[PDB]
């Protein structure tokens, strides 16, 4: 484990995702509202999945070597197995908050799968220049997601209860800022141009992951928007 | 790229799926009917997924070598990753058109997963004679799907609006004819008996894919069956 | 095939899953109740999936070698591909029986995915002591599932029709007893401590699989709880 300088950030990430999972699990014990139960189930699964994948990276299972640039490059593939399941769950939290229609939910989840799937292909591609073709396709899929979150959901939240509109607006802004950083870290990190070393890259993804999952969840599950209007 | 004679058909397929995706995306911009939005989302995702997998084959990522018959045989595995997601989406288009019940939808999607999954196992199997055992199981799963589309959905469409009944009947006939060709191309192509060479096999799958996805989508999204009855 | 002593139990399992699939398929022909169709579709898919994965193990495709303990250990990875899809389908049978809320269904299916996913990682892990870390995480996920089936569903079934309450109680008890045996067989078998040899381990999993899928299905599909109350 300790033979890799980035191990400290993988261990911290593992701990923070595990602690986040347990807090949400305990906090959700005393909840019977069927609407609130939906948000607790979605939001608790997110850091639980991330916990297992951070642990796999810490123990060395989620790491492979990819030859490109005449070098064997360490690629943590477990990140994409994490994101494949956690990013659509996070979008479902937002879509259920605004009572989005089914067709829009399917478009979001499908574009998200394309985003993560093409990012994985780009991470494992051995022809250096082709890695950035996949990065560009994946980034186009992300821009579609961000467009929908702004010019489809925002207008839908305003016609909703005030507390669900204000909570959505906050979580929307958090998501757009944090998610946009991921393609940048990829491009300048060891998967892309190799400007930033792997140990610093790992620290950046850990800060982003914890903020986008645990921080996101703390804002959502403390809001009254997750409960139905009741007397 | 150009070192493979089949590259021209992979490049054409990539272009036609990309163009198809963009047309459906633009055409769906001016749509607010929640029913129509469902069909546009399903139908636009189909060629978008196929685009990415054709590109992976063009660039050489979606290709592996499988030893059988005393030879290293080029097997494009990316086809099955495509079909795993696009064939159930196409069946969902048909099932939603006739307002199929949930139990029937689950049976269709499950049989479809078995069809594609066993076809993938057959494509990667190293014992030559066993490849055709998997082909037979996969073909049995397809025949179940075709039976349901005829002796379960057809009777349901007649009790529906006339425009949804006539549109379903057309898309049903297109699907049964085109899908039935796939097991035949597999059997006589490089995955099976090896009668037809890979470059011709690739041309045939490209014609079938574009027809079953883009051609299918053009018929559906030009129909009024996708809109609810409104004044 | 016959070069492996466990082949006899893989062949028996294949036959019993295939026969089970055909019986459920025939029995479900004469069913039009939309509620009953749901249970028949879920319950017939379970042994059909298991059939294909037992066949892959029989023919040698679903087997790999994992080095640990200074030895190349035969690991049947196809079991986890089976369980990944069949265990959530079995939980869906139970959840639909008691009309569970959506949030609870998602929590069950998500915990089940974590259970199977971490068990697969543990089966393929090359550092011997780490294999049991994954076993423990997977077992914690199972205990969560069992808790929900007892202290969330049981109370919900009592407020239901008497026949659905008594049928659920029976299937609940069958599930908790049979599922609990799996982590024990893993721990003492070739994936874990290696006390029980592989051929005996394979026999035990076959008895458990057939009972948990075909036996489970025979109890459910003979009950009147799967039909709506009708005159
Ligand atoms: C009902 O809706 C509320 C349940 O949602 C919340 C239910 C959760 C979604 C269930 C998923 C958690 C499982 C219990 C998994 C247990 C293993 C975890 C990874 C444990 C990690 C923390 C600890 C080991 C440090
Ligand atoms: C509606 C939305 C959900 C739609 C989703 C969008 C999606 C279509 C976007 C594209 C996804 C696609 C790129 C997934 C590729 C997975 C692949 C990286 C797995 C590893 O295989 C890659 C190479 C080794 O580098 O295999 C070496 C050769 C091996 C012999 C490969 C044989 C196994 C194949 C991988 C079998 C295909 C399985 C499916 C891809 C499983 C789904 C994986 C997940 C990442 C989507
Ligand atoms: C709301 O419902 C309508 C949206 O459906 C339609 C929405 C679509 C389903 C969203 C999926 C498309 C994404 C925007 C993916 C973008 C990358 C594409 C693969 C681009 C391919 C064409 C071009 C690069 C040649
Ligand atoms: C309700 C419906 C959706 C049900 C679906 C029906 C489905 C059950 C039908 C059978 C599907 C099954 C054959 C999928 C097999 C995937 C497999 C080809 C992936 C590549 O692995 C094959 C060998 C190399 O040749 O791995 C070499 C050895 C490696 C060490 C393998 C270890 C990884 C395992 C593959 C882990 C299992 C992952 C799941 C199979 C992922 C789903 C893939 C998709 C193709 C279903
Ligand atoms: C409508 O709801 C009822 C259909 O459910 C029941 C429908 C089933 C869920 C459909 C799935 C079965 C498919 C027909 C697959 C056929 C291949 C099987 C694996 C055959 C195995 C048995 C035989 C080959 C020994
Ligand atoms: C809501 C719920 C459904 C959530 C589900 C819970 C889930 C997150 C729990 C953890 C699942 C995770 C451990 C799955 C790992 C699959 C992995 C074993 C496949 C084989 O790859 C392992 C190594 C060889 O040993 O690959 C060698 C290196 C290769 C180069 C690997 C590159 C391919 C990657 C495997 C791509 C990721 C694909 C996804 C993991 C596909 C889903 C598989 C299924 C088992 C979940
Ligand atoms: C909890 C994890 C989250 C919210 C991860 C989000 C990840 C992304 C938005 C990743 C995006 C990428 C691109 C847009 C292209 C480059 C490759 C990716 C996958 C890093
Ligand atoms: C857009 C792609 C489509 C509609 C693909 C359809 C593919 C099939 C219907 C494939 C069927 C197969 C068999 C029936 C057995 C032989 C292997 C397959 C997977 C080619
Ligand atoms: C039809 C198959 C069924 C119902 C299989 C159930 C399997 C389990 C409940 C497996 C549980 C495991 C653990 C709890 C940890 C050890 C590894 C597993 C996956 C065997
Ligand atoms: C979206 C965030 C990207 C900003 C990356 C900042 C990295 C600064 C760290 C110093 C770079 C290390 C280079 C010298 C080793
Ligand atoms: C009462 C609110 C705080 C509860 C404690 C939460 C502990 C989980 C770890 C959170 C750290 C990361 C927060 C986002 C920066
Ligand atoms: C379902 C369509 C299958 C028909 C295949 C027709 C192939 C004819 C092309 C000529 C065969 C090439 C053999 C000589 C190289
Ligand atoms: C107005 C209808 C035609 C629009 C142009 C569609 C261009 C997408 C490519 C379609 C070619 C394949 C059609 C099926 C044979
Ligand atoms: C949950 C069931 C686990 C019980 C396992 C009993 C196995 C007894 C078979 C004899 C053990 C073989 C050891 C000598 C070869
Ligand atoms: C009339 C009920 C029996 C029908 C025959 C079922 C045959 C399928 C194989 C069942 C054997 C396994 C039963 C569970 C132990
Ligand atoms: C490729 C993996 C995608 C599945 C991720 C799991 C979450 C799915 C959310 C589905 C939302 C409901 C759509 C109607
Ligand atoms: C990782 C694979 C999980 C999917 C298994 C297929 C069954 C899914 C059941 C979904 C139940 C409905 C949830 C609302
Ligand atoms: C185009 C939709 C408007 C909202 C999206 C904001 C774009 C942020 C740019 C992200 C940069 C990634 C490289
Ligand atoms: C048996 C259901 C009737 C409709 C299915 C038509 C069968 C077409 C044969 C396909 C040939 C594939 C080898
Ligand atoms: C803790 C929830 C109560 C019901 C679960 C029964 C636990 C059975 C123990 C299984 C042993 C697996 C190692
Ligand atoms: C080795 C660098 C080659 C540059 C390729 C950049 C491709 C980016 C595509 C974005 C449209
Ligand atoms: C090398 C050819 C061996 C023939 C096997 C055919 C199997 C087909 C099974 C269809 C029932
Ligand atoms: C080689 C045996 C090492 C023992 C590790 C046991 C780990 C079990 C963790 C359960 C909390
Ligand atoms: C609940 C605390 C979980 C912390 C265990 C993971 C941290 C790795 C320490 C080496
Ligand atoms: C929108 C046009 C997309 C065409 C790019 C793919 C074709 C491959 C050319 C080499
Ligand atoms: C319907 C009977 C299915 C039996 C075939 C599988 C058994 C393997 C025999 C070698
Ligand atoms: C993106 C930063 C999240 C901050 C988490 C703190 C929330 C406390 C209510
Ligand atoms: C299967 C052939 C499809 C033909 C596509 C043309 C549709 C234009 C309306
Ligand atoms: C767990 C044992 C199941 C027994 C199956 C027999 C059911 C006949 C109704
Ligand atoms: C990490 C355990 C949390 C302790 C309870 C927090 C207040 C519900
Ligand atoms: C109005 C809410 C502002 C939230 C933005 C937070 C950016 C990290
Ligand atoms: C909408 C604000 C985008 C912020 C992008 C930050 C990328 C590091
Ligand atoms: C009555 C519609 C006929 C459609 C069949 C088209 C076959 C390619
Ligand atoms: C229902 C007509 C079937 C046509 C099969 C064509 C196979 C090449
Ligand atoms: C009251 C029903 C008892 C069922 C338990 C069966 C254990 C195999
Ligand atoms: C609730 C009874 C548990 C039985 C466990 C059996 C494990 C072999």
């Amino acid at each position: 484990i300790t033979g890799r300088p980035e191990w400290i950030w993988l261990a911290l990430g593992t701990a923070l995702m595990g602690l986040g999972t347990l807090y949400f699990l305990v906090k959700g014990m005393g909840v019977s509202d069927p609407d609130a139960k939906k948000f607790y189930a979605i939001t608790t699964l997110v850091p639980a999945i991330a916990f297992t994948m951070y642990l796999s990276m810490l123990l060395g299972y989620g790491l492979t070597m990819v030859p490109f640039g005449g070098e064997q490059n360490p690629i943590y593939w477990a990140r994409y197995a994490d994101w494949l399941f956690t990013t659509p769950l996070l979008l479902l939290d937002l879509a259920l908050l605004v009572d989005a229609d089914q067709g829009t939910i399917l478009a979001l989840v499908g574009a998200d799968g394309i985003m993560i799937g093409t990012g994985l292909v780009g991470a494992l591609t051995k022809v250096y220049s082709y890695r950035f073709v996949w990065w560009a396709i994946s980034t186009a899929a992300m821009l579609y997601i961000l467009y929908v979150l702004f010019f489809g959901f925002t207008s839908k939240a305003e016609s909703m209860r005030p507390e669900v509109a204000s909570t959505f607006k906050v979580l929307r802004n958090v998501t757009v800022v944090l998610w946009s950083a991921y393609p940048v870290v990829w491009l300048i990190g060891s998967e892309g141009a190799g400007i930033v070393p792997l140990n610093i890259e790992t620290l950046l993804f850990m800060v982003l992951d914890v903020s986008a999952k645990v921080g996101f969840g703390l804002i959502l599950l403390r809001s009254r928007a997750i409960f139905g209007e009741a007397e």
Side-chain angles (χ1 to χ4, degrees), chain A residues 56-141:
Chain A
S56 81
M57 292 190 283
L58 179 65
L59 304 179
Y61 182 87
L63 171 70
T64 192
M65 298 293 165
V66 181
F68 60 83
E71 297 160 34
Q72 295 286 340
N73 304 270
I75 296 293
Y76 282 100
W77 61 262
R79 299 195 185 282
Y80 305 90
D82 176 341
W83 303 344
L84 174 62
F85 297 106
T86 54
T87 50
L89 289 172
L90 289 164
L91 294 174
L92 199 64
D93 262 344
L94 295 171
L96 295 181
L97 200 55
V98 301
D99 191 41
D101 64 87
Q102 296 187 349
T104 299
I105 291 172
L106 191 78
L108 276 168
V109 173
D112 189 276
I114 292 168
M115 179 180 70
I116 303 303
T118 55
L120 174 64
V121 172
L124 302 176
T125 290
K126 307 188 199 191
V127 179
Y128 185 68
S129 64
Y130 293 167
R131 299 175 67 84
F132 303 100
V133 174
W134 294 110
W135 176 92
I137 292 163
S138 179
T139 296

Side-chain angles (χ1 to χ4, degrees), chain A residues 87 90-96 98 100 104-105 108-109 112 142-157 168-169 171-177 179-180 216:
Chain A
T87 50
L90 289 164
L91 294 174
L92 199 64
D93 262 344
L94 295 171
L96 295 181
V98 301
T104 299
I105 291 172
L108 276 168
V109 173
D112 189 276
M142 188 193 67
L143 290 171
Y144 175 82
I145 291 167
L146 301 188
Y147 171 80
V148 173
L149 294 184
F150 265 109
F151 306 93
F153 279 14
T154 294
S155 175
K156 179 60 184 301
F168 168 79
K169 149 181 123 77
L171 296 174
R172 177 204 71 194
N173 292 345
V174 167
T175 297
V176 174
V177 170
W179 286 36
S180 296
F216 179 100

